[PDB]
Amino acid sequence: QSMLWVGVVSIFPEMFRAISDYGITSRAVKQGLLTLTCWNPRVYTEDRHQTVDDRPFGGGPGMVMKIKPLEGALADARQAAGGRKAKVIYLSPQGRQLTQAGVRELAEEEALILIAGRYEGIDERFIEEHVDEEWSIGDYVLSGGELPAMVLVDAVTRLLPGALDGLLDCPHYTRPEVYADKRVPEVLLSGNHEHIRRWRLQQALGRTWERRADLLDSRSLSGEEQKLLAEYIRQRD
Amino acid sequence: SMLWVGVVSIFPEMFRAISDYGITSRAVKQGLLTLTCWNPRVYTEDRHQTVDDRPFGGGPGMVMKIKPLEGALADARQAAGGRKAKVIYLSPQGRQLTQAGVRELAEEEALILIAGRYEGIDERFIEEHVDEEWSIGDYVLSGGELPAMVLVDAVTRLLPGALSFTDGLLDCPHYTRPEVYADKRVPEVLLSGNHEHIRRWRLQQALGRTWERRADLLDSRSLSGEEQKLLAEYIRQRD
Ligand SMILES: C[S@@+](CC[C@H](N)C(=O)[O-])C[C@H]1O[C@@H](n2cnc3c(N)ncnc32)[C@H](O)[C@@H]1O
Ligand SMILES: CCN(CC)Cc1ccc(CNC(=O)c2csc3nc[nH]c(=O)c23)cc1
Numbered sequence: 001q002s003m004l005w006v007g008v009v010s011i012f013p014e015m016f017r018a019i020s021d022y023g024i025t026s027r028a029v030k031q032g033l034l035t036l037t038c039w040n041p042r043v044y045t046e047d048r049h050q051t052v053d054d055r056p057f058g059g060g061p062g063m064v065m066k067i068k069p070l071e072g073a074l075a076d077a078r079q080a081a082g083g084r085k086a087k088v089i090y091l092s093p094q095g096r097q098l099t100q101a102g103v104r105e106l107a108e109e110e111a112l113i114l115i116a117g118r119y120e121g122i123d124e125r126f127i128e129e130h131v132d133e134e135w136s137i138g139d140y141v142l143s144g145g146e147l148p149a150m151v152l153v154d155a156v157t158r159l160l161p162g163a164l165d166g167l168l169d170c171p172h173y174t175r176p177e178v179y180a181d182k183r184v185p186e187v188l189l190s191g192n193h194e195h196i197r198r199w200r201l202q203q204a205l206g207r208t209w210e211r212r213a214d215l216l217d218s219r220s221l222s223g224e225e226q227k228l229l230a231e232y233i234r235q236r237d
Numbered sequence: 238s239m240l241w242v243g244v245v246s247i248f249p250e251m252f253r254a255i256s257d258y259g260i261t262s263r264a265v266k267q268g269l270l271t272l273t274c275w276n277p278r279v280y281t282e283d284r285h286q287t288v289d290d291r292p293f294g295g296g297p298g299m300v301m302k303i304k305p306l307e308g309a310l311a312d313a314r315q316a317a318g319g320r321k322a323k324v325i326y327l328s329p330q331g332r333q334l335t336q337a338g339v340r341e342l343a344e345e346e347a348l349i350l351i352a353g354r355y356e357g358i359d360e361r362f363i364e365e366h367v368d369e370e371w372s373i374g375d376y377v378l379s380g381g382e383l384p385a386m387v388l389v390d391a392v393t394r395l396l397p398g399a400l401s402f403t404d405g406l407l408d409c410p411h412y413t414r415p416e417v418y419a420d421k422r423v424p425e426v427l428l429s430g431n432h433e434h435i436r437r438w439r440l441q442q443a444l445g446r447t448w449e450r451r452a453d454l455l456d457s458r459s460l461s462g463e464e465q466k467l468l469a470e471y472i473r474q475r476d
Contacts, residue, residue: 018254018386023379054413058427058435064413093401094408094446099375124410125421138374139335139402139454140391143260147387150254154383155376168330172357174290174300182361188294196294211332215375 002035003160004109005084007077008149009070010116011052013038015146024164025157033160036153037080041065044072053119062120070115070122074130077113086111088132090122091145091152095134098152102135106152107159114152116145166219168208170200201225206232238271239396240345241320243313244385245306246352247288249274251382255389264399272389273316277301280308289356299356306351306362313349320347324368327352327381327388331370334388336402338371342388343395350388352381405458407447409439437467445471 008016019025020036028034042050046068053063078086087109096102106112115122115131127134137148157163173184187199205228208215221229244252255261256272264270278288282304289299314322323345342348351358351367363370373384393399401408412423426438444467447454460468 012258015254015258018251018383022248022251022382057412057414057423058430059432064411067413067415067418094450096450097374100377103376121411123413123418125412125418128421129419137387138333140339141336141394141401142387142390143394146254147383147390151373151378151383151387154378158377158379169357171360172300173293173361174302174359179303179361180365182364184293191294193295196296200294200296207330211330
């Protein structure tokens, strides 16, 4: 009955408590908006040492994940999905960088089977055969795909209806009015509810321009927001 | 220990995912990593005031107070000792983390990471105490705990003894046993070639895969004579 079924293929399923016990994903799991199941490839091995790493063909340092244990856990995950259209995602640095655009696309799916790789990664033929899409969470290399898998689940979950632009946010201020010789901008303490809306929007635009100008090349600035940005750039030291 | 990490988060027990598992866990055991947590809620004035307060000027949502954060931070600073500690705020508004930044962060002796929730943080605390602001990518998460864990993991691989985007290129494909799987056979160069044939093929595959998937990384990185030939040969023979 859940609006998104997620199956995670990982040798560390305990690690995923970070999303099952905490936050919006945890809430969604309880509310039944998200079914979160794990599939340890180690419980699909033929030896007592639960060996899941194989040597690489052509030498070189590192290990490759063993194909048969992965095959097992994937088949089992596919089985539990039922009649749901399940997209198989491999979390990989070589994948399509995840952006909110991709998150919206992934949120439209009814089932997601996420492969959390380890060591040097998973065999190319295994990808070629089973994987539907490859995603990266950013241009940095991590030790495994469990944290990227959890990041993907969290990002998509917020979009699931009931769980809860291209412009950075405005700065935020809370109690006290003055702290360590630093005072809250007057516009917030004494100002119109449309002039606070004005200032916040102007700060949003300005901070985006200052830090993430690329997000503004993508965006198409309106008349109203170009004037507030011009005001920001000119009213700045 | 080699590197000292202190995490300022309202969910300190979430960090069990990196302290108990993988390379980071190994590093903590081996004594290369020192992982500590600092809950801001155990620093309020009264145990009645929440960590989340109201935003000045109205609007929807909540903000994180300066005092609870300031307490945890001054305390985290104390435990670092004589170590030069860089204070990082994990935020979507920060500049995007790349392997370049990871290498820079790995050179540090101590790191104090600030994880916030969906609520903002009072700008004055940032202005005053934060040394760097980092984002893990252009997507919205509920909080900075997973980005904090991602930062710690990325950095700990670089710590000597614990064990794409290295040379600005993606990686080559990988193949393991069996020689033939699902009617697909391991490229001969790996089964029969020498250690020079293999280097050349792997480099050609890394170039080709980068060109195919992340052409932007190639606009940035300049291509050499040997590389352009390996890439031309990749493009022209791909099909
Ligand atoms: C040592 S890393 C990748 C090594 C190498 N670049 C490769 O994939 O051939 C091992 C695993 O961590 C995951 N991973 C690492 N960095 C990632 C990132 N930036 N985004 C998503 N997954 C990542 C993937 O599941 C990958 O198979
Ligand atoms: C209070 C302002 N929020 C909009 C109502 C903006 C906002 C703040 C904090 C978050 C939570 N994000 C992080 O803590 C975070 C920390 S690092 C990071 N990297 C990529 N994406 C991220 O969401 C993050 C999300 C939105």
